[PDB]
Amino acid sequence: MYSRADRLLRQFSLKLNTDSIVFDENRLCSFIIDNRYRILLTSTNSEYIMIYGFCGKPPDNLAFEFLNANLWFAENNGPHLCYDNNSQSLLLALNFSLNESSVEKLECEIEVVIRSMENLYHILQDKGITLDTD
Q: Which residues bind a second copy (CB under 8 A)?
A: 3-6, 8-9, 11-13, 15-16, 21-33, 41, 43, 45-46, 48-50, 61-64, 66-68, 70-71, 73-77, 79-86, 90-91, 93-95, 98, 101-103, 106-107
CB atoms within 10 A of CB 97: 11
Task: Dump the DSSP string for 10-59.
Answer: HHHHHHTT-S-----TTSEEEEEETTTEEEEEE--SSSEEEEEEEEE---
Closest CB to a second copy among 10 and 121? 10
- Give the Cα separation of 37 and 115 in Å (integer): 10
Please identify, using beta-carbon distances, which residue of 49 and 117 lies nearer to a second copy.
49
Least gap, CB of 126 to a second copy (angstroms): 18
Q: Which residues pair with 54 in a beta bridge?
A: 38, 91
Nearer to a second copy, 80 or 122 (CB): 80
Provide, rounded to whole angstroms, the least separation between the CB of residue 2 and a second copy.
23
46 vs 133, beta carbon nearer a second copy = 46
Quickly count: other Cβ atoms within 10 Å of residue 57's Cβ.
16
